Amino acid sequence: EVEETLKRLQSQKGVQGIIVVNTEGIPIKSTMDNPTTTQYASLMHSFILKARSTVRDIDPQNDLTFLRIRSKKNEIMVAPDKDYFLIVIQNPT
Amino acid sequence: EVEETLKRLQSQKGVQGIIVVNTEGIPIKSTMDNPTTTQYASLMHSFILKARSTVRDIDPQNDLTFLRIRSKKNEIMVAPDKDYFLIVIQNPT
Amino acid sequence: LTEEEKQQILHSEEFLSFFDHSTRIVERALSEQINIKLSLNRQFFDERWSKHRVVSCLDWSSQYPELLVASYNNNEDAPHEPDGVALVWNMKYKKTTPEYVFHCQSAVMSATFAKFHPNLVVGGTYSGQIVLWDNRSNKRTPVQRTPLSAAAHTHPVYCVNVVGTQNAHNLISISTDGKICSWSLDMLSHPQDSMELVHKQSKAVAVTSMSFPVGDVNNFVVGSEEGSVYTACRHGSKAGISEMFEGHQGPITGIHCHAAVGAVDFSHLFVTSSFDWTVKLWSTKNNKPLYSFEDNAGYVYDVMWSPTHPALFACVDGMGRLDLWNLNNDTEVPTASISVEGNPALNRVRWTHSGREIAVGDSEGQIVIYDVGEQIAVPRNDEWARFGRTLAEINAN
Amino acid sequence: RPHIRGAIREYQTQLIQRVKDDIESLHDKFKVQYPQSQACKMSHVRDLPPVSGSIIWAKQIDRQLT
């Protein structure tokens, strides 16, 4: 359930990229090229960890579970978990 | 108009009211206490600007007008324009 | 970290668009989420703006379907509240909150939509005052108000619609005395064609929830306060309230004609869900009650024919019952004569712009909307033709 | 036809009692005053009079009578 899951969620409402994070957003499984998938997933991973640190600065016993940025050109629905800081690059529809 | 605006938005499933942090990291709007949401909104906007740098370096045209930073127990949802940023806590119910 | 200059920036008008987008995007985040036969779509109940606010009419939006002006007449319970309230509601998101609130200064009666303008709302009132509601600003107060002179808008306009598309959009305000005044979709200084209709005698024809026959020409039926239904226009000398449709037993309160013919015959017919309580069907060239329906309980006020299926309708009573009838399929029985919540006199029933959805304007405030997947456009043209024919025969034997 | 009227009378034994129920329902609805129903507020919406709404209401009950 790797490539079929890839195409399954990429064939949704304009999902430009989705990979469940192995560790620090760099899996071999790339839905797009090296920057958009690997580098940008790593940036969303470390910076969503910084967002975890933000809520941690607000409430240290409150890590992050999800993120949702549905706007003009994307529906970024990032979900940090125990092993993955989920990456979603989407379209508004 | 702030009365009907904040009231109809507070009428949702757990909205704590409209509290907007500016583009500086200062809570320009605060329906709650000043020190608590001031420190929360300040750290929120500092890393929101970090998340803006992140997302704009990833998705070049993502106006941060919607941001559901879901934590382990609450979602400090940000539903503003591009410049200012709302800081309202609501659990992911 | 202080909020001195910050709260004074809040006091400034700099955040008008910001509060508008705050309302919209927080309502985008209204349906909270986690990561780990009538369908009854959604009842529209605002908290402050929809309580002791008797609904005026349910106008539908051409641009951005699944949107209606929840036009509320200012009831006697709220004189101090702003006279006349209109609301828009996102019928898809399933939000208990209206998308944007638009009250008025005159008692709203048949408020409509600024066609081809999602950022603007405009509609008539009790004073005939078609006021402008700007949606780009959070100014719920009417930014532009129609004059209330003698020859101008004076009587309650229950029909303020354009003629055809934006080509020759003549937003003619048909009032309770015949003061027909055309307009455009955006100008609100002086009406386009300020004039007045003429009746056979005693010109004060209180029109009430009229419509247009299929073709949607300037010919408008009359929801006259005395039965004996008429048809007129505003363009030229066709503004005569004289084509009497005698045979009715009460003030025409709910009258809606045949919608755009798509699955049935043409049949320029209009049913009259009025004070006779036994809803009467009528053709635009009949002058006889084509078909009298069930004797409803109490004062009937509204009806509308679905834009999907242009032959069926949904009549009401005075004791809260939505009698939605099928015509090409049945004659003496309706489809689902449901009873709306409580037993009030149902004010409005207007089918959704998308079709197959009945918006029942309730008592005060709330708007119970019955979604249907049964009142579909069944391809029965000769059946509906023979229906109107046989009852156009039985109307006078 | 009398042959069918022999059965029509059997139906009438139920029909006339149901018309008595209808008349009694009209009695109760006539005793229900006009401001009790929401027809006064709806008359204000459609710009109809309340007291004339009561008399047109009563004459409509007379129409159901006849």
Curated annotation (Swiss-Prot), chains A, B:
GO molecular function, one term: microtubule motor activity
Main location: cytoplasm
Keywords for the protein's UniProt record, in alphabetical order: Acetylation, Cytoplasm, Cytoskeleton, Dynein, Microtubule, Motor protein, Transport
Residue ranges the record marks as coiled coil: none
Location within or outside the cell: Cytoplasm, Cytoskeleton
An example Gene Ontology CC term for this record: membrane
Swiss-Prot/TrEMBL GO biological process terms: microtubule-based movement; visual behavior
SMART domains: Robl_LC7 (SM00960)
Gene3D superfamilies: Dynein light chain 2a, cytoplasmic (3.30.450.30)
InterPro entries registered for this protein in UniProt: DYNLRB1/2, Roadblock/LAMTOR2_dom
Tissue: High expression in heart, liver, brain and pancreas; moderate in placenta, skeletal muscle and kidney; low in lung, prostate, testis, small intestine and colon. Isoform 1 expression is up-regulated in 64% hepatocellular carcinoma (HCC) patients.
UniProt similarity note: Belongs to the GAMAD family.
General function of this protein: Acts as one of several non-catalytic accessory components of the cytoplasmic dynein 1 complex that are thought to be involved in linking dynein to cargos and to adapter proteins that regulate dynein function. Cytoplasmic dynein 1 acts as a motor for the intracellular retrograde motility of vesicles and organelles along microtubules.
The protein's assembly and partners: Homodimer. The cytoplasmic dynein 1 complex consists of two catalytic heavy chains (HCs) and a number of non-catalytic subunits presented by intermediate chains (ICs), light intermediate chains (LICs) and light chains (LCs); the composition seems to vary in respect to the IC, LIC and LC composition. The heavy chain homodimer serves as a scaffold for the probable homodimeric assembly of the respective non-catalytic subunits. The ICs and LICs bind directly to the HC dimer and the LCs assemble on the IC dimer. Interacts with DYNLRB2. Interacts with DYNC1I1 and DYNC1I2.
Name of the protein described by the UniProt record: Dynein light chain roadblock-type 1
Organism the protein comes from: Homo sapiens
Name of the gene encoding the protein in the UniProt record: DYNLRB1
Curated annotation (Swiss-Prot), chain C:
Gene Ontology terms for molecular function: dynein heavy chain binding; dynein light chain binding; microtubule motor activity
UniProt KW Repeat keyword: yes
Main location: cytoplasm
Outcome of mutating residue 289 to A: In NEDMIBA; likely benign; can rescue neurodevelopmental defects in zebrafish morphants
Post-translational modification: Pyrophosphorylation by 5-diphosphoinositol pentakisphosphate (5-IP7) promotes interaction with DCTN1. Serine pyrophosphorylation is achieved by Mg(2+)-dependent, but enzyme independent transfer of a beta-phosphate from a inositol pyrophosphate to a pre-phosphorylated serine residue.
Compartment(s) of residence: Cytoplasm, Cytoskeleton; Cytoplasm
WD repeat start-end pairs: 50-99, 103-143, 152-193, 202-242, 247-292, 295-335, 341-380
One Gene Ontology biological process: transport along microtubule
Annotated GO CC locations: centrosome; cytoplasm; cytoplasmic dynein complex; cytosol; dynein complex; microtubule; vesicle
Keyword terms of this UniProt record: Acetylation, Cytoplasm, Cytoskeleton, Disease variant, Dynein, Host-virus interaction, Intellectual disability, Microtubule, Motor protein, Phosphoprotein, Repeat, Transport, WD repeat
Assembly: Homodimer. The cytoplasmic dynein 1 complex consists of two catalytic heavy chains (HCs) and a number of non-catalytic subunits presented by intermediate chains (ICs), light intermediate chains (LICs) and light chains (LCs); the composition seems to vary in respect to the IC, LIC and LC composition. The heavy chain homodimer serves as a scaffold for the probable homodimeric assembly of the respective non-catalytic subunits. The ICs and LICs bind directly to the HC dimer and the LCs assemble on the IC dimer. Interacts with DYNLT3. Interacts with DYNLT1. (Microbial infection) Interacts with human adenovirus 5 hexon protein; this interaction probably allows virus intracellular transport.
Family to which the UniProt record says this protein belongs: Belongs to the dynein intermediate chain family.
Protein name: Cytoplasmic dynein 1 intermediate chain 2
Annotated organism of origin: Homo sapiens (Human)
Swiss-Prot record, chain D:
Subcellular location: Cytoplasm, Cytoskeleton
Effect of residue 5 to C: In CMT2O and SMALED1; slight increased BICD2-binding
Transmembrane parts of this sequence: none
Disulfide bonds: none
Similarity section: Belongs to the dynein heavy chain family.
Disease entry from the Swiss-Prot or TrEMBL record: Charcot-Marie-Tooth disease, axonal, type 2O: An axonal form of Charcot-Marie-Tooth disease, a disorder of the peripheral nervous system, characterized by progressive weakness and atrophy, initially of the peroneal muscles and later of the distal muscles of the arms. Charcot-Marie-Tooth disease is classified in two main groups on the basis of electrophysiologic properties and histopathology: primary peripheral demyelinating neuropathies (designated CMT1 when they are dominantly inherited) and primary peripheral axonal neuropathies (CMT2). Cortical dysplasia, complex, with other brain malformations 13: An autosomal dominant disorder characterized by global developmental delay with impaired intellectual development. Some patients show signs of peripheral neuropathy, such as abnormal gait and hyporeflexia. CDCBM13 is associated with variable neuronal migration defects resulting in cortical malformations.
Quaternary context: Homodimer. The cytoplasmic dynein 1 complex consists of two catalytic heavy chains (HCs) and a number of non-catalytic subunits presented by intermediate chains (ICs), light intermediate chains (LICs) and light chains (LCs); the composition seems to vary in respect to the IC, LIC and LC composition. The heavy chain homodimer serves as a scaffold for the probable homodimeric assembly of the respective non-catalytic subunits. The ICs and LICs bind directly to the HC dimer and dynein LCs assemble on the IC dimer. Interacts with DYNC1LI1; DYNC1LI1 and DYNC1LI2 bind mutually exclusive to DYNC1H1.
Protein's gene: DYNC1H1
Residues represented out of the complete protein: 594 to 659 of 4646
